[PDB]
Amino acid sequence: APITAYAQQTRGLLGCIITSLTGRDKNQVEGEVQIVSTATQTFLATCINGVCWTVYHGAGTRTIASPKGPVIQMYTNVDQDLVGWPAPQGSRSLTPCTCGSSDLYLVTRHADVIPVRRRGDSRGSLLSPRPISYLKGSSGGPLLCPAGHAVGLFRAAVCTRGVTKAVDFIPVENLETTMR
Amino acid sequence: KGSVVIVGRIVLSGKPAIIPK
């Protein structure tokens, strides 16, 4: 049915730092998109096909904190700007899109869903341009097709004068490629 | 270098609900 989303915050500044250092995270996990932080930065990771993915330019080679200490990346592809860990216990994965639709829907770190028109393999245009401050920290989040299946991961925003009209994304296909 | 940390989540799979009292 219709895409709708909500956000919940599970950790504050201080538990985040401590957890970053111990690499030990005991909180229960839910949902399909995880809000993630480093020391300097916060963004999104999306679970597709049992793996939790996000952008290399944010995570780098870093481990992810888990109930069992740090967990090493399963996939690392610098050219694709794509990184992946095994999906946390309790997360739920998105299904890759197979309908080839050109009407995409980007899920934001604030849990808004904004319409995007597909204009290429890896680029889409916003139907309503937005201030860049808005999309900040949404990198790593999903572009969905009308059925709610994953088409791609938000990679970068094309901004002019602080206003975004287009986004570049990593297509689901490149995920599957990276998996091989 | 520190581990990436889950600080929050977005849930896509919830559907319309009457808010409980």
Ligand SMILES: *C(=O)[C@@H](CC)[C@@H]1[C@@H](NS(C)(=O)=O)CCN1C(=O)[C@@H](NC(=O)OC(C)(C)C)C(C)C
């Ligand atoms: C993701 O959340 C983007 C902000 C909208 C992204 C940032 N990623 S993150 C995970 O928050 O570290 C880093 C800067 N981001 C960009 O999209 C920058 N654009 C960029 O590299 O664009 C091209 C010129 C198209 C390659 C923008 C905002 C300056």
Ligand SMILES: [Zn+2]
């Ligand atoms: Zn589809």
